Amino acid sequence: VEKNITVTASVDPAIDLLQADGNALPSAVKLAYSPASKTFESYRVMTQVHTNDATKKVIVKLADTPQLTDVLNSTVQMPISVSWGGQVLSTTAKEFEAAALGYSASGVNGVSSSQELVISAAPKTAGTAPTAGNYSGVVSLVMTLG
Amino acid sequence: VEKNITVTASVDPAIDLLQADGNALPSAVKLAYSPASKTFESYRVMTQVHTNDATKKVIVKLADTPQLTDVLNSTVQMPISVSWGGQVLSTTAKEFEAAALGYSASGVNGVSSSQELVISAAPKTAGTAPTAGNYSGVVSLVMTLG
Amino acid sequence: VEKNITVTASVDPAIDLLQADGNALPSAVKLAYSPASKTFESYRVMTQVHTNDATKKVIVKLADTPQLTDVLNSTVQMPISVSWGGQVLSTTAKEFEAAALGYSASGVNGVSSSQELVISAAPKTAGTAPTAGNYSGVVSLVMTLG
Amino acid sequence: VEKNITVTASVDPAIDLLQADGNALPSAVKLAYSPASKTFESYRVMTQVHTNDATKKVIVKLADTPQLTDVLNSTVQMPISVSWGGQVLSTTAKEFEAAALGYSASGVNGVSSSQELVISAAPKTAGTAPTAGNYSGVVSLVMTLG
Amino acid sequence: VEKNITVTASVDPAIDLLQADGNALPSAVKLAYSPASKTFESYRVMTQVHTNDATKKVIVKLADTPQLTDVLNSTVQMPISVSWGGQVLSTTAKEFEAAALGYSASGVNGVSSSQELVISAAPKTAGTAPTAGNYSGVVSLVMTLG
Amino acid sequence: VEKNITVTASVDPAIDLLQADGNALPSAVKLAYSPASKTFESYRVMTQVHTNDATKKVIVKLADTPQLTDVLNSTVQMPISVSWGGQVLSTTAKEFEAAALGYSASGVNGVSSSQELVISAAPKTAGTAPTAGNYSGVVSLVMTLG
Amino acid sequence: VEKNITVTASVDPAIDLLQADGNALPSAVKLAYSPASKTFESYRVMTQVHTNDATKKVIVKLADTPQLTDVLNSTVQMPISVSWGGQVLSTTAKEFEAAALGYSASGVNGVSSSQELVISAAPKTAGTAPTAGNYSGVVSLVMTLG
Amino acid sequence: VEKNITVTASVDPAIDLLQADGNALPSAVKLAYSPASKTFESYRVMTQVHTNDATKKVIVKLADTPQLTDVLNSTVQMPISVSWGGQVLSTTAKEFEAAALGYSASGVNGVSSSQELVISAAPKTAGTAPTAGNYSGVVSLVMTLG
Amino acid sequence: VEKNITVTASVDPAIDLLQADGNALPSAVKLAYSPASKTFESYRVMTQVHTNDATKKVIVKLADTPQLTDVLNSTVQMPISVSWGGQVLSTTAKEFEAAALGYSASGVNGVSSSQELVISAAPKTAGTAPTAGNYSGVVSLVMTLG
Amino acid sequence: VEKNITVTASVDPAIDLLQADGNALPSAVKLAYSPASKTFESYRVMTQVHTNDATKKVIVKLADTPQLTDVLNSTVQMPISVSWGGQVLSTTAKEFEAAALGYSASGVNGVSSSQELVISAAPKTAGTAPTAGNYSGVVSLVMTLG
Amino acid sequence: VEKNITVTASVDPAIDLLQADGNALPSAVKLAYSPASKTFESYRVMTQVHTNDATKKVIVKLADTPQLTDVLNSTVQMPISVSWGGQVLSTTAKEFEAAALGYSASGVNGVSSSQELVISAAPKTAGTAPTAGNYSGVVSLVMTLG
Amino acid sequence: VEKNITVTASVDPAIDLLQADGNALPSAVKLAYSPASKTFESYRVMTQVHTNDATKKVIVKLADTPQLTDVLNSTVQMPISVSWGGQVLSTTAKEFEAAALGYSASGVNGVSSSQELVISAAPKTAGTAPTAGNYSGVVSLVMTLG
Amino acid sequence: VEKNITVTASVDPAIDLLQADGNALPSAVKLAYSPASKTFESYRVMTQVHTNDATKKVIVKLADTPQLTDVLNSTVQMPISVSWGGQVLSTTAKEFEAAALGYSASGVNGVSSSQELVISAAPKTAGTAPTAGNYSGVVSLVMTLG
């Protein structure tokens, strides 16, 4: 009754971000939208960086296009509003103090403190509800260790 | 340590239903079953419609098959009993008074009053417990603004 | 570093069926089989017809042989059980009411309501598990606009 | 504004255990740990069996591994201490008298009396606090009707 | 608007393993890695064997190479740590008692009890984080009925 | 039982583009078309350039005819809309900053950051669905290192 | 409208290797090359030997020249790295245990277990990317039944 | 640098069969053979007749010898098993209903529906694997419009 | 067992066209014809010019008669539609920019970029299917270096 | 309508070489030439010796003049580069081990394994493209059984 | 520069056989011989009779000596094995049904269907390879219209 | 063993026509005849004029009698249809532009481009097959340099 | 109807040269001439010496006048260029090794290997085309056995 399965992984020492509970982060999410408020639902997560070096500061930015579109119209576009660690992130570089994270906090060396993550996104135009339709797009959270 | 994520959304002005607390509704649920009562658990939610027009009445119905089955026998079937807003819903059209909802109620224009939602479901046959097994099926809650 | 790629497409106005989320449908699928139940896994999808004419009724049937076989024995055969839109489909013609689909539903004109799709298949014989082996076959979902 | 939802269920006549109030039981729980006492928090519930046969005695055991671990180290392990109905449960079979439960008690035939449930768990080693970290594991409460 | 689809299946009486909920098992998975712990994420599933003979004991082993590599360097290798049913599995034969599984348990004859599945994997070397890179490899879970 | 196989390859140092996961890119793709939107499906991929020189900027253009046709009428033509790296590509030369790609990002020197790829294509004429038929054509993605 | 077609085949009892799914194996393949790693892509397949005698051990080797070249320079050469069944193959004879393959495994007598196949190939020289160009060559997988 | 090329074609109005995608059909094919099943591989294609008259029924048969042989022994012979359009074909005349093909189906007038094609072939003798060797032979698919 | 073989070649410096993969081009081809579309099959190739001088522009034309006929009636004639490099070719002279070809592209000096080749051909008369019959004719692709 | 035909043949026991598929070898071939590489196209074939004695070793050489010329200038000459069976051949005698060929391989006694054949040829002078012109010459592959 | 040429022809109404493609048949052929099989190569052609009368049946036989010899020993002889139209031919008269040929088939009146032609030939003696040498002989295919 | 041989030649500067490959032209040819089409086979060659003066235009005509006859009846006659260089030739003078031939084309000065040659011939009478018999006659291709 | 015929022959043991196929050699030949190259056509044959003594070496030369002339002017003369067996021949004596010919080669004792024969001839003067005219002359190939 042999039943095979695929396995994969990705290592990248000077560890990535992870879920605060000690699991992986999502690979997807759904957001709502209320044109009575003209906002998506502000998706939120608490997360805990790990590392392999407790001093080096962590660098963050994004790829060019944190924006959605129509699943069957590539022309429609709407940006995305991202923020983590207590403030906004950009396509340009940010950098966070290692001391401001508690690597020797509750758990074990490398485990930072729990950090607020936020994924919002809004219409590009104010006072304007976008077109009725299923929309989609990807955030490619650039991040590294300085 | 770049870590990308998918995002999606769906707009449809003249807003859908939403959770009363001001969040999204469930995408899934589990129900029990007691053949000592021969009923599932009557799942319940309080919800709050939004809109983009405070006068137009809201229309409701369902798709053809609010019924479950066996996860490995498509032949087994059992209907589902749905009701919202104080009464039952059908595959045929209902319609609710806008004035009977309080769009200028506690919060802000468009926010209706909190509405009782109910998802029950029962054996198709009376005095008959169905077969032992994991069962499944989807409700496609048709709804729109008249 | 020039790297070329093939592209294709198929148009057929009075649109085909599509995935409910606003994407393409599968080109393949795998089904299980439990001879403890003597059924395949009842594969299921929610889908949304489009069109170029909101009145005309949609016609459906199948090609002659919705049946599987052995990948290395063409003699073995087992039929397939298909159903969509709330009922079974045949090699003979069905036809669905346009009004019973909600082309002016949640999204935009032409977008029907979400429709249940089902792909099951069973042994031709009752109380009979077929031969151990990888099996295969194709469904050619005839469909058009009346 | 059509918004679909998943539904599921599981039947198994000769009913499972249920919450004493007449609801479902938890699907999860959190426990603390005090190495000043070197114990988790003794989680507790009152519950009420149902059935479809008031005479047959109810059998209980567990799957092999009522033990936790580290969420990112499968090697760490610590057992779990379970007890229900007034005494301990095992990976081996127990069995409870039907008469000792009051199926004709307060409510209606089948409704047993309220039964104490207990979920504790401790370090495998005495005088030893385990490693700092989020831990996890599942109990698979085998149970049936004799 | 004819739209064809492929279908396949695989039978093998004396059934394979399946998802505990009554669905298929995954065909793929992703694991993380924290060199602060120097472990992948311990992936886990609860599963339920089926059969066509309730007495015969189930045999298990693996193919030669439960190990990963680099997607663009076949030389890199790291083993994989598998365990199911309460203990480890090997490239050599194991065998499980039928009585220790509950084929007459909650559901119906053949349906075993829910069994813990675990897929971990670690660096071959201790105190050594592997090279930064996307890695891959397959487990071919040999299994049969004794 | 000797069974021979062909092998080929193509080298071109100052590496081509590759799949972000660390595999090859597609050699083909299928696109849909909805004349309710009058768009193909916006096909998308995340990709990661490699190189042999981390400073030199990467040049891009296309061959003359990013357009489809009819498989049995060479006269029918419809252009193609391509874009990569955050913007559109042409039959004329583009050029991308090396610093804006993260060659020292998550993985190893040369591995750029993950880049959005997009393959759309539309009718040449607005408000015009093309003829019913299977269509085809090739994109020859000119690209090199400046 | 008579339209003729060629057919061929090759028998060789004591069967050759075949695709694990129950189909033929490839007649060709493409490999990449990254001089950032200085490796081709490690091509991989899972396969299942058949036979006409379940005891006899299977012998393997290769023809003299598992190496590529330039399509327009026969002088350029680079070897190929092959391995199957859990280890490397040579121009010299190997031999595999019949018992170590599971001919009475999941399917039917003769069907071995699924075996890992690997086709890699590298520059003959270390720290040396070969010349820019389309390359080619054939592997003639000698194999027989001992 | 003048480089000449041959061109040919064949017209025969009341069109021949063609590939379903809108291309030509194969001029050759290879089949396997497993004497563990004692069958070739059941080769399969989906195809779409065209015509110049939508009413007339299409006639089919074969030439005398749908059989293979040895490439260096004309005495060896083995028949071939052909079937198309949902059933078997012969050296004698068949005939298919025009209405049962959908000439006004998805595409344009004349384009029939997609039709299953099958090319199998077996040993003439049961329980008998033929001689080891490369074999060959041609099918001359007689067909016309009634 | 001496077995002799003929060899030939043709040099012409300032190289001819060649197959893009790095092989020779075809010496022949077959085209279909569908009088439901009244077109042959649009045959296509991607190709790569070479040279011995990277500046000089390449000149193209054709011989007088890019037309087919009947294999046993020289009177029947039908022209041929040729196009390469992004546009049509004639019996008169064309000329292509060297800079518009990428001789320093992916490979090595002289290797142009991949160029689309097209060989179509149609009935001389519109709304007219030619006579049933095998047809033939040659294209003599005049070409040189300006 | 009597139509006569010539037939010939050549026997020479201790068989010659033959095509690997089980057919005759070519009597002619065309080679290209790229003075951007200054090489002909490396023509290649896989072949299978036969014999009438499985032990005796096979001897090979060539006649004096494996070289081309001009079809209208006998003075022009360019040598030819031949190699078979994994290495080069000469006007002098080579000899191959019978055991190194697999006469009891896939097929039947006498049928050797598939052997790589290569026909290249180059300008006699380095850095020198020969004269523009059609060239020709014959290889007389001396070969026998030792 | 006057250059004269010979021309000839042969008419014989109630036409001879011809090549199926619409060309002449061969005037010569070469056959191999493998005394490992002790057979020549089974030469084969597909052909299409023409006529001037669609009813009359076609008669066939041969001249006395379908046999080869030595080019320098007239005493050596070996017969020839001919077959056409689905069966063997003789020095005695055969005759074929006109209706069994499709004169109103794909092309035009008179054009029969494509017919298998076969030219084999073998040693006169079994288990006997003939003498080493170039051999020759002619078949004079008697044929006419009954 | 002295063995003598005749040699001849013919010079005529301002060269004659020659075979395009760089060889002599035929001295004879055979044509078929199908009274189902009432045409001979349209014999065809590609050829390349040479010269000793690249400007002068080439003149062409024929001798009086491009017609066949019976080999044993000089009274029977049938004309011949000749055409070269893209059009018909006569017993009267034609003349071709030197510039329209490419003397500086692919090869070397004097070598014209490849020119289509055609030798057809038909019954003198329409709807009339000539007498059964071997026929013959000569074309004397007058040609010179103007 | 008595019809007589002449016969002749010539014996000369220690055999002459013969055609490689096993026939006689030509008694005549025609050569072309291109004053664009100022060469005749290089006539060529492959041939096979026989003998009556396998050791003795074969001697070759020519008679005095391997030269042509005018058929009606004996004064015009042009030499001839002969070469055989891999090199030139003279009016003086050459001699070839018996061992370098393979008398025990493919066929039977005495049959040498196939030897290249060449008959060229050129103007006596360089840069000089001879007079327009039919020319002639004989080569008397002296040859014997040393």
From Swiss-Prot, chains A, B, C, D, E, F, G, H, I, J, K, L, M:
Subcellular location: Fimbrium
Superkingdom of origin: Bacteria
Gene Ontology CC annotations of this record: pilus
Coiled coil: none
Presence of the UniProt keyword Signal in the record: yes
Subunit structure as annotated in this protein's UniProt entry: CFA/I fimbriae are rather rigid, thread-like filaments of 0.5-1 micrometer, with an apparent axial hole, and a diameter of 7 nanometers. A single CFA/I fimbria consists of about 100 identical protein subunits.
Family: Belongs to the fimbrial CS1 protein family.
Annotated protein name in UniProt: CFA/I fimbrial subunit B
Record gene name: cfaB
